[PDB]
């Protein structure tokens, strides 16, 4: 499990792109808030072990490799919780 | 420029993995409802291409081999379209 209030400090490195409410304002950017919180591990995991490639994944990969597994599970816990609307 | 009509009509071979919504039941599978567009066209080009390993990933690379560019389009515009919430 992880640690929702961990999870929102460790976010501001992440709003930059995904907006401080988990929705991004960029198009190329995608949206966190709500989504499924084993998804969001899954997908954590990937780009740390550089399993994401093609478009900007290189960038991401790039926010994912200094993240612990703790660090990912409190950043999962934290976006699902949030609401996909806002 | 994808046609969300279309794209809803394809959809139909999506939706018992991401929910008739594009809010999914299964905590593996991710929501897709109000997704940036952009980022829906390009997830899909890159499971489409073998660009995304890990999890559970060659699953949807199952899924997305036999769509067309512009089914690509038309799904992400769908689901795009639809509200993040249900
Ligand atoms: C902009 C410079 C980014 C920063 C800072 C972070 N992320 Fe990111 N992320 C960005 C892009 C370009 C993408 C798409 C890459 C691709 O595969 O095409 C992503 C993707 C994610 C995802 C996956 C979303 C999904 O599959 O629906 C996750 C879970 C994610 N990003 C999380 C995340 C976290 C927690 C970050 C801070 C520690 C973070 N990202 C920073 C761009 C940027
Ligand atoms: C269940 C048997 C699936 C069917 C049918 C479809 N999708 Fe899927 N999709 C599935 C899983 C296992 C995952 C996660 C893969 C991973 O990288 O771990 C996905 C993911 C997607 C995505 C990525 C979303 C994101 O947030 O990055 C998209 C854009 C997506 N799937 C779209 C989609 C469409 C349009 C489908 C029908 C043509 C489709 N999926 C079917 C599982 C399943």
Known sequence: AGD???????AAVCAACHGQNGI???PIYPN????????????????????????????????????????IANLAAYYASNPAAA
Do not use: F, H, N, W
């Open 32 to 71: 966190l808030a709500g989504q499924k919180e084993q998804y969001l591990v899954a997908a954590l995991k990937a780009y740390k072990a550089g399993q994401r490639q093609g478009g900007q994944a290189p960038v991401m990969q790039g926010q994912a490799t200094a993240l612990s597994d703790a660090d």
């Open 24 to 26: 991004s304002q960029v």
């Open 4 to 10: 929702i209030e961990a999870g929102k400090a460790k």
